[PDB]
């Protein structure tokens, strides 16, 4: 199956459960960091929920870009948060996509991305 | 005849000036003089080119930040020497991904309090 890597700072469970429809979902501190980097390299698609500021999510996205991974960033503008210029500026509408969404439609959006 | 190129990033204003002022003792500080998606792309392109040209990356990682995290991820993938500075007094818990990236050599994470930041930078660069 496609191997899907998910990164997030109840909606996370929603996202992972729907991701499982479309592939195999991947996800002391050192072995974690090494394990996640092995999974990141094995992934066909990297999915990140980028609404909450997170050093960790950002680091995973940086490593994923350097591995030339396909990346889907999910951002909720109704949160009132300002998405990092570095993430919004990294978007290429192809290998790096930033999709704005409302909580209720997250499944329907994931279906559209992976059914296309 | 180039000095070492130092890239500073961080999400505090007095602290950032102290850090940048001290880094100027050790090299060129690339980001010293840093609204819409078009400008966001310029920021990203500019920062990524300065990151790739840097010798040392210094990041203040106390405030959670997608952008700082992303710069660190690109810096590791560029094989840059990295110093992360974290203030535990903030009450924040540093991301395990960052703490786990440390290897005590080319990627170091130092816990510090504000009064000693110049002395710590002296220790790293001397």
Residue numbers in the entry:
A (entry chain D): 20 to 28, 37 to 54, 72 to 160
B (entry chain A): 18 to 28, 35 to 57, 68 to 159
The authors write:
pmcThe enzyme 2′-deoxynucleoside 5′-phosphate N-hydrolase 1 (DNPH1) (EC 3.2.2.-) is responsible for catabolizing toxic 5-hydroxymethyl-2′-deoxyuridine 5′-monophosphate (5hmdUMP), a noncanonical 2′-deoxynucleotide that, if incorporated into DNA, must be excised via DNA repair pathways. DNPH1 catalyzes the hydrolysis of the N-ribosidic bond of 2′-deoxynucleoside 5′-monophosphates to produce 2-deoxyribose 5-phosphate and the corresponding nucleobase.5HsDNPH1 also accepts canonical 2′-deoxynucleoside 5′-monophosphates as substrates, albeit with very low reaction rates. The dimeric form is common for DNPH1 and is essential for catalysis. The overall fold is similar to previously reported inhibitor-bound structures of HsDNPH1 and rat DNPH1,6−8 with a five-stranded parallel β-sheet core surrounded by five α-helices.
